[PDB]
């Protein structure tokens, strides 16, 4: 063999595209989450 | 005369009381211990520690019996346990040192027989005692109010 | 009242009751039978399991026959076939027992007369039955009251 398997480039296209996908859905979900618990405290405040 | 309403038994102590209130029965979060009524306490209640409170619909069988909740809350003098207290600036005031611990959780009823309020504790600055309590917005929004350093009771 | 209201026979036996509100029929849909006329029963009924209930148009003879139908619903008590019933908080709420099964389709009436709520059935407990009456919006929507465990009269 004439390289090394880097590990950035192992991933193929379509595979590191789906390991992004579901990386993305869970910190999304997390994200939007925390985004949530953020703007439902507000909603108090703003009509105390 | 408010007869409709339950204090919390803890080793035997009147801790704080709860009300039945649109046939959800509630009492104070941080009130410790059981309530007097063995149906009652059946009730596996839903908490708000937004508001030290904790909720959960009242058994098929008393809900007819329940206090009904009041929106409005025009400045004047309020009913108690404890005789009666006074709304003024948005809060309940009392006599200064008047009540304390154990009392949280007593209702506060509208002259026509009807809860405006649940108190949970108060503060003195040095005048006069203002109470801590959960509210409703006229919209009917429900609130909890707590003075500048309140104590829980 | 009787003069505009009916009875539903079991083959024989009284299981229901009917009632007409600005010439439409009505009855509970739940409750089998036949009207005691021949004119009522005669008219084909429409049914809408979301109202439990069914209705009808009468002929015009009798066009003038029948409850005029508000909903002007202040809390407050209103009078009934059995005695009075309260109203409040958005509850129509009576003595406890009294009704019972075979009772629906019995209205609530004004003190004009004029009918506000149609009976489904209801809760038995406590003080006070609350009643699982069908009644309208202020915009005069239909609307449909079911309190927790309620029955079918």
Same mark, same amino acid.
């Given at each position: 063999?004439?390289?090394?398997?880097?590990?950035?480039?192992?991933?193929?296209?379509?595979?590191?595209?789906?390991?992004?996908?579901?990386?993305?859905?869970?910190?999304?979900?997390?994200?939007?989450?925390?985004?949530?618990?953020?703007?439902?405290?507000?909603?108090?405040?703003?009509?105390? | 005369?408010?007869? $409709?309403?339950?204090?919390?038994?803890?080793?035997?102590?009147?801790?704080?009381?709860?009300?039945?209130?649109?046939?959800?029965?509630?009492?104070?979060?941080?009130?410790?211990?059981?309530?007097?009524?063995?149906?009652?306490?059946?009730?596996?209640?839903?908490?708000?520690?937004?508001?030290?409170?904790?909720?959960?619909?009242?058994?098929?069988?008393? $809900?007819?019996?329940?206090?009904?909740?009041?929106?409005?809350?025009?400045?004047?003098?309020?009913?108690?346990?404890?005789?009666?207290?006074?709304?003024?600036?948005?809060?309940?005031? *009392?006599?200064?040192?008047?009540?304390?611990?154990?009392?949280?959780?007593?209702?506060?009823?509208?002259?026509?027989?009807? *809860?405006?309020?649940?108190?949970?504790?108060?503060?003195?600055?040095?005048?006069?005692?203002?109470?801590?309590?959960?509210?409703?917005?006229? $919209?009917?929004?429900?609130?909890?109010?707590?003075?500048?350093?309140?104590?829980?009771?």
């Amino acid at each position: 063999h004439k390289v090394d398997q880097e590990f950035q480039a192992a991933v193929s296209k379509t595979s590191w595209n789906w390991l992004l996908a579901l990386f993305g859905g869970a910190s999304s979900l997390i994200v939007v989450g925390l985004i949530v618990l953020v703007c439902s405290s507000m909603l108090i405040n703003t009509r105390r | 005369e408010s007869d $409709k309403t339950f204090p919390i038994m803890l080793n035997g102590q009147v801790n704080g009381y709860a009300c039945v209130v649109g046939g959800r029965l509630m009492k104070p979060l941080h009130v410790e211990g059981k309530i007097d009524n063995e149906q009652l306490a059946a009730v596996k209640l839903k908490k708000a520690s937004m508001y030290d409170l904790e909720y959960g619909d009242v058994p098929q069988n008393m $809900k007819s019996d329940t206090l009904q909740y009041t929106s409005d809350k025009p400045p004047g003098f309020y009913n108690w346990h404890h005789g009666a207290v006074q709304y003024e600036n948005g809060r309940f005031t *009392v006599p200064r040192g008047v009540g304390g611990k154990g009392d949280s959780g007593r209702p506060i009823l509208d002259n026509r027989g009807r *809860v405006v309020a649940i108190v949970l504790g108060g503060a003195n600055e040095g005048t006069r005692t203002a109470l801590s309590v959960v509210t409703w917005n006229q $919209k009917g929004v429900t609130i909890k109010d707590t003075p500048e350093g309140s104590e829980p009771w």
